[PDB]
Symmetry: C2
């Protein structure tokens, strides 16, 4: 089947289409104005793989956390796209997406995701890929102050890969914790990494109707 | 046939559905966050008239002028909705929409539309309904300084109905011009008034594909 993923949760916007494993994706840093770029990206990606919106089985959307406005804009477009085509929707975490990206690029299986939320906050998550490739640790997603993150890091063990803008925003985090951290090579989520996660949810039937697609509230 | 109109160009957001003349509409003042309200409004309206998105013949969208961000958000959702359903799109002017509203509520046939654009500017238009009900004067749409509007008013004649927030923002306009002005009873556009205009365009085949739907640039 086919899965179309869309992400506009952060400073970047991206689209990806999954077709029996074969991926078609596009990623670009999105200005303070995302909306104007999604639709064209979507139509390009669909055309590239010779697919119609009505031929897609599910539409994966970025449920955040991240930009309050950006996350909601993306969900809005996604719903529009899914409603007009009667498509089931799949919410995917921005933090989990970056973790999958770390696995894709560096083979990391334990990811500490930290997003530099404005005004001194950070969106945090501790993700660990299990044997079936499902990222465990969604219950750890939270919005914390740098200080509490530093506190959290002292309770962790084993090695981890770091992903997200939060690390460069608060360089003391990786420095003061006694953990062995590796660079996940992921600063921002990419729709292409949303696909593997959306597919596993589809396989389990964890989808939502258009009217129930919403942003995560941490 | 059926026409679905959506407007989020100004401080208000609205949706309306035309079914062989029978209208179903909803209007509400939209906060600094519109996106979150459109989809539900759309699904409500479609359900109320027992219609599916795929049963609609055209999707009318607010092409502005108005909020730079608001206008683009609306177009984005509309495109999403139209693409997933393979629907032809119809751009409708925010100023013309308010003029149609004035005709609906007061029978006005000559409308001076003025929108209070931020930072001391005003979106302006001189609209006149012809015998077939088509609003002539689209070529007059422009972004002007209050002073130039006052200047423009001195070149006009006959009576006019006033619509838009621009009049209350610059009360000297109606006071210093020698024109007989009547209250159009319309401060903000309503999707329901976009319908008659979208229908005439549909009848003439003046529609655009999803990828060509864009905001007006004054």
């Amino acid at each position: 089947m086919r899965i179309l993923a869309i992400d506009t949760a952060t400073e970047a916007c991206s689209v990806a289409l999954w077709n029996n494993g074969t991926i078609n994706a596009h990623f670009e840093l999105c200005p303070r104005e995302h909306t104007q770029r999604i639709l064209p990206m979507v139509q390009e990606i669909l055309a590239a793989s010779g697919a119609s919106l009505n031929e897609i089985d599910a539409l994966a959307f970025g449920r955040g956390p991240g930009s309050f406005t950006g996350v909601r804009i993306g969900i809005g477009i996604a719903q529009g796209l899914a409603l007009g085509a009667n498509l089931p929707m799949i919410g995917v975490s921005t933090l989990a997406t970056m973790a999958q990206g770390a696995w894709r690029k560096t083979g990391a299986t334990r990811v500490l995701a930290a997003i530099d939320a404005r005004m001194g906050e950070v969106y945090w998550a501790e993700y660990q890929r299990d044997a079936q490739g499902v990222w465990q640790g969604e219950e750890t997603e939270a919005v914390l102050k740098p200080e509490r993150v530093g506190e959290r890091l002292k309770q962790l063990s084993g090695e981890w890969a770091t992903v997200g803008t939060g690390w460069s925003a608060w360089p003391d985090l990786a420095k003061e914790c006694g953990l062995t951290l590796h660079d996940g090579e992921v600063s921002l989520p990419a729709a292409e990494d949303m696909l593997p996660i959306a597919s596993q949810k589809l396989a389990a039937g964890e989808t939502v109707a258009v009217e129930h697609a919403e942003p995560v509230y941490l």
